[PDB]
Symmetry: D2
Subunit: 106 residues, 4 copies
């Protein structure tokens, strides 16, 4: 998918997690987020279209996805241990990584 569609997948699944009843709903949504983040990895965003892939700016852009992917990994372990509310709350904290990238690169 393109970068726009992977971002819509991240936004919509965050909302499904906040309104979940059960563990099954939370796990499935985190798995969809992990796939979207991994597919987005080598996208060039509009703001950096004149830069090389090996520039400081593109190395920094990719660093944001490493962090996001790490956080989704941990939240999914919480959900699979039966700590559903702890997983929802970790999902709420992911938003600061979202905002950090957007303020520099969007």
């Amino acid at each position: 998918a393109d970068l726009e569609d992977n971002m819509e997948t991240l936004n919509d699944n965050l909302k499904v997690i906040e309104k979940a009843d059960n563990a099954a709903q939370v796990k499935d949504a985190l798995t969809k987020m992990a796939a979207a983040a991994a597919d987005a990895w080598s996208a060039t965003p509009p703001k950096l279209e004149d830069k090389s892939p090996d520039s400081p700016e593109m190395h920094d852009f990719r660093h944001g996805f490493w962090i996001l992917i790490g956080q989704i990994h941990d939240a999914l372990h919480l959900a699979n241990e039966g700590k559903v509310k702890d997983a929802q709350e970790a999902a709420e904290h992911l938003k600061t990584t979202c905002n950090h990238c957007h303020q520099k690169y969007r």
Copy 2:
């Protein structure tokens, strides 16, 4: 790209790291390894084609890629820090993650 071509990218760049004679060659190889691992995320290997996408087997397959991606992240920081031989040596330790997934799933 498909799974077999992602694996050939991982294998070539591990050899570049070993024969490297400057820091730039090591940084560039690790970056290519990270891109290939993120692109492999979503693949279904031949041996698990008769399982569901949400099967315990496929969840465990994907967990191996989370582990590899995390180890590459740390190796790249070491290289950028000036600790280049330490980065090469950490790259050699990646082999046990490669071997673990192959024994279970290849």
Copy 3:
């Protein structure tokens, strides 16, 4: 090496990072913060004095220090690659983790 004193060390060194002129001051403060977090890992907080060491609350308490330690680790790598303003801004983001534990257990 009691909990109160480890917390003073966390708070003091965060202010140092916020006011620093140079990269040496940031690296030293981050290293002191990691020491204090590792030293706090095994403490029993006053609010959980009545609980089993194996309770869900105490497992969760310890998990919070693992999260803080991982974030400090990343910020120090950024400082060591010359991305000093980025390490400073990352140190500021630590406050979300500080306050998440405080709201549950302080």
Copy 4:
């Protein structure tokens, strides 16, 4: 505890995991290993006792404990999701991290 007692705790609980009869034994042993690793973090080993705390060797020594602590963290999550065999096999893999530090500093 001193460094020698922390290493005896690490060695003993690794054999406990290998020979475990049930899941509770594996979780307990991992939690004890994490405590010992966190307590060892600030120790000065005999081979480095004459160099300064800011030396590259002490920085590097401490980094190896961060790596060990992260691997125990992931293995405890696997045990708590019910993947206890996988947690046992992950614990076996820790040995290469133990051996790497011993090769360099013991």
